[PDB]
Amino acid sequence: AEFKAGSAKKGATLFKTRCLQCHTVEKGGPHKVGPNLHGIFGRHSGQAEGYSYTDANIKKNVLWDENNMSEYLTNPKKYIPGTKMAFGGLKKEKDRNDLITYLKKATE
Numbered sequence: 120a121e122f123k124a125g126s127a128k129k130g131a132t133l134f135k136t137r138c139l140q141c142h143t144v145e146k147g148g149p150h151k152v153g154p155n156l157h158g159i160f161g162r163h164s165g166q167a168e169g170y171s172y173t174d175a176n177i178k179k180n181v182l183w184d185e186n187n188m189s190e191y192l193t194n195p196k197k198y199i200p201g202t203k204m205a206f207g208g209l210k211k212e213k214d215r216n217d218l219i220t221y222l223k224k225a226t227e
């Protein structure tokens with residue numbers, strides 16, 4: 120139910136196949152369709168500098184941690200109604216744990 124650390128190696132592969140199309144992770148990385156994700160954890164939503172968010176994403180004002188990130192990625196539009204992230208989600212809990220384990224380090 121809660122987040123448990125997993126395989127960052129698998130998480131990186133998940134990011135390439137599922138996220139890299141719309142996202143980058145390094146500091147100073149370019150925005151694409153979606154925002155650069157550097158410094159995302161321990162930060163309130165809508166605060167990637169340079170990126171223009173929806174009202175939905177800003178109004179949600181979620182302080183991103185591993186658990187709500189997992190809930191978010193299960194079904195983005197369910198968690199933040201009106202968001203323009205055209206992504207259906209990661210339904211498998213193992214995938215979400217793996218992906219988030221990678222993200223926490225890659226956006227550190």
Ligand code: HEC
Nearest residue numbers: 137138141152153164165166167172173176202203204206
């Ligand atoms: C497009 C094809 C996307 C894919 C695939 C993924 N994401 Fe995304 N994401 C996208 C957009 C356009 C946005 C902004 C939505 C808005 O309402 O403005 C997002 C947003 C996020 C966020 C929130 C960032 C914030 O600062 O609040 C996160 C944390 C995020 N995306 C993560 C993420 C992950 C982990 C993905 C794959 C595993 C992923 N996204 C795919 C566009 C797209």
